[PDB]
Design a protein around this ligand. Sequence first.
Ligand SMILES: CC(=O)c1csc(NC(=O)[C@@H](C)[NH3+])n1
Ligand SMILES: [Cl-]
Length: 130
Amino acid sequence: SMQEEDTFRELRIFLRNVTHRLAIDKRFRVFTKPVDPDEVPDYVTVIKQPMDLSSVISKIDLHKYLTVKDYLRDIDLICSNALEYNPDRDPGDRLIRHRACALRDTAYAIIKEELDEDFEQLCEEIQESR
Ligand SMILES: CC(=O)c1csc(NC(=O)[C@@H](C)[NH3+])n1
Ligand SMILES: [Cl-]
């Protein structure tokens, strides 16, 4: 229905706003673009499902997210990929892991404060009906 399309449009506006706030945070720069194979050739082979904030924006605009739960799965993937790719004790790896956890924690905190639970429930019920 048109009311349901309005609901998903509001969801997309909300998700673009959250994503923009993450993307402008200097700590999260490493997560804003796909990994360049010229700089890191072994990435594309170790990480089977890459994800980054630019790809998240593209997915919002392609209407790939019908709930915040599905968006958070991709935030979780950005973080889990970073932990997997940077598992060593060396400070470069530890810095990226700390930033990855901060990205995840920040996204969840914004959503806890700003997502209305009944709005998310409505999205989930529309999604389940299709
Ligand atoms: C997106 C991501 O997790 C990423 C990009 S480079 C990197 N790791 C390093 O640069 C190590 C070698 N210090 N991780
Ligand atoms: Cl840096």
